[PDB]
Amino acid sequence: QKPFDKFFIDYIGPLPPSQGYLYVLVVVDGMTGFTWLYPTKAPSTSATVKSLNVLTSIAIPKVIHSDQGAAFTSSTFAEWAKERGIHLEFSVERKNSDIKRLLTKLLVGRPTKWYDLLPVVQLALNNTYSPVLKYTPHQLLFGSLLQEIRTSLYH
């Protein structure tokens, strides 16, 4: 019902090494579909916690939903969530597919440069319209590269 009520989280990667980064932590807000992308060296509990402490400095989600990935099912992650009163669920898929498709296209001719281009992927994702919705994720949350990205998202 509210932004920041529920996060859906997942790892994408590995990608070609880029400034030592190999993975992207994907966080999708349930209500708005707003996506945060965090580059990490590993798909680990500690990188997940690092990124999510940054995000939860804005607001604390009631629920976090993920898959059974090792980053998410550790007792360290469980402890972190319990300390904050966060309910963890395990088992938006369209959103995650979109992101993967975006990343693949952007690697072409420049595989080591994805870290630098990452902020523009996120900007693109949050300022593009979904098939059935009338507003962008950015609008819902706050009340050439860009062209190529929009190609993948709109076609």
Check: CB of residue 118 under 8 Å from CB of residue 39.
yes
Is 10 labeled as ligand-binding?
A: no
Query: Among candidates 58, 60, 48, which has minimal Cα distance to 13?
Result: 48
CB of 136 to a second copy, least distance (A): 13
CB of 10 to Mg ion, least distance (A): 5
CB of 125 to a second copy, least distance (A): 10
Pick the closer one to Mg ion by CB: 71 or 149.
Answer: 71
Q: Helix axis angle, 114-126 relative to 145-154, nearest 10°?
A: 50
Pick the closer one to a second copy by CB: 8 or 36.
Answer: 36
Q: How far apart are CA 94 and CA 85, in angstroms?
A: 29
- Indicate which of a second copy, Mg ion, none lies near residue 53 (CB less than 5 to 8 Å, by partner kind): a second copy
Q: Name residue, tokens 């319990």.
A: 82
Is 29 labeled as ligand-binding?
A: no
- Indicate which of Mg ion, a second copy, none lies near residue 108 (CB less than 5 to 8 Å, by partner kind): none
- Kindly list the distances between the CA atom of residue 77 and the CA atoms of 5, 28, 30, 44, 125, in Å, as whole numbers in the listed order: 19, 18, 20, 10, 27
Pick the closer one to a second copy by CB: 59 or 133.
Answer: 59
Could you list the residues known to form a binding site for Mg(2+), using ranges.
Answer: 5, 67
